[PDB]
């Protein structure tokens, strides 16, 4: 049926940690990049800077994340960052218009065809992989903020990432992963008990695809040309020749 008082408290905590993702931009440079009618590779990297830095505030304002060692925090963010962007990408994507629409700034759009400027031999595989992952997440879950937030935390708290060597980090990360996943299970039954089992059973599949798309996205900026004027953060997750 309905959620317990305890889960609702945990959903408040989750809602607060993600409340920064959709806050208004404060800088005008960032707003101006998002306003452009055409985004080149450098522009896409600056846009990602916005999301990545917000993704980092989210994780820091997360109690569970503060139970991990400092080196384990770096490791989880370094390894899950692209996947979490790709998830956010899915939830603000308009399959009809073929563009991304940031909640933080209406009237602002990013053409899907921005891929046609990325690494030439891989860009087509990525477009398809993005749209495949998108289509593996049903409408009702994709449109549900808390549902994606919980899954965002499930991908974050991945115990098998490079860098997680501390047994304590591994154990606690596995435990969080398991708890978050049980939360989503109960949550999906509270908002639509009709197809909850089917929906929940589908997300693991969709997550295997996410991992695949996000993995071979790291070199998308190779052969895209000069990106030396782009934000530096994003260039720590994406390979560049500049």
């Amino acid at each position: 049926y309905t959620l317990s008082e305890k889960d609702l408290k945990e959903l408040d905590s989750i809602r607060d940690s993600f409340q920064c993702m959709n806050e208004p931009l404060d800088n005008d440079q960032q707003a101006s990049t998002l306003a452009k009618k055409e985004h080149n590779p450098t522009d896409i990297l600056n846009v990602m800077d916005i999301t990545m830095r917000r993704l980092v505030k989210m994780a820091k304002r997360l109690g569970a994340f503060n139970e991990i060692s400092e080196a384990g925090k770096f490791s989880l963010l370094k390894g899950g960052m692209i996947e979490m962007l790709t998830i956010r990408g899915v939830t603000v994507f308009n399959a009809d218009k073929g563009v991304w629409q940031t909640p933080v700034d209406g009237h602002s759009q990013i053409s899907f065809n921005m891929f046609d400027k990325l690494r030439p031999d891989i860009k087509d595989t990525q477009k398809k992989g993005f749209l495949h992952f998108f289509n593996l997440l049903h409408s009702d879950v994709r449109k549900n903020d808390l549902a994606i937030d919980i899954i965002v935390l499930m991908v974050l708290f991945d115990s098998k990432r490079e860098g997680l060597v501390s047994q304590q980090d591994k154990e606690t990360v596995e435990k969080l992963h398991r708890n978050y996943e049980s939360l989503l299970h109960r949550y999906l039954y509270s908002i639509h008990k009709e197809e909850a089992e089917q929906r929940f059973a589908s997300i693991p599949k969709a997550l295997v695809a996410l991992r695949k798309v996000a993995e071979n996205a790291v070199t998308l900026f190779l052969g895209a040309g000069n990106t030396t004027e782009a934000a530096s953060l994003p260039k720590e997750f994406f390979a560049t020749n500049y």
């Binding site: 400092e70 770096f74 720590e236």
Partner: peptide, 10 residues
């Protein structure tokens, strides 16, 4: 030595 690390530490 790493923006990501610096954001984390700060």
């Amino acid at each position: 030595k790493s923006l990501l690390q610096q954001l984390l530490t700060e």
